[PDB]
Symmetry: C3
Subunit: 86 residues, 3 copies
């Protein structure tokens, strides 16, 4: 048959001009960043995510997330605390 198929939602990783690494985390519905040096994982203040699939970071440090399960793209303008929906 193959009556049931499903796709695995993608996992994203991105690295900014300074080597800081940004990762989607499906199980905790969050996006985290890891500055190399400090042994600290920062949870970024995105909200209400459902299975973030992709992350990118522009020159200005702005972070963008494909929020797969909510059919949208969210961003966090660098040192803004409020998420915009694109």
């Amino acid at each position: 048959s193959h009556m049931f198929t499903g796709l695995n939602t993608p996992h994203g990783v991105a690295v900014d001009s300074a080597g800081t690494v940004y990762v989607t985390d499906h199980g905790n519905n969050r996006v985290v960043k890891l500055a190399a040096g400090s042994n600290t994982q920062t949870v970024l203040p995105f909200t209400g995510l459902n299975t973030p699939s992709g992350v990118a970071v522009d020159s200005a440090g702005t972070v963008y997330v494909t929020d797969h399960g909510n059919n949208r793209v969210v961003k966090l303008a660098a040192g803004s605390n409020t998420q915009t929906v694109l």
Copy 2:
């Protein structure tokens, strides 16, 4: 919304100008949105099946994993005709 009509987005990339590129997996297409734009453009890729990853180089060429077709395609800036890698 400002991106409009997305279904199950798989991937996002951002170019040096802050233009945002998105794989719209559920609709088999790739869309883009300039930094702080109202309007979105659909890129002229063709015959995609569940596009997934997207990247953009410093020349503005857009690369996409055509996950359902096991291939990678690319589109030069302002081109209408993709190349398969």
Copy 3:
């Protein structure tokens, strides 16, 4: 299939300053790259991958890949090919 070959359900793509294209060849548990105007794909020396997904590359040529679904991020250091878990 022109120059990439034998891909199965690929996920992430990334491109470096040299225009080298990196593809997470998800279905084959490997990461492949294609140098500008080369006709030969290179399988990077990651080991122990399983359903990898996202891929990024920094200016230094370090490659990061999401791996074992949600479990981890693997970093391949340029030159040494030392693999570390982020």
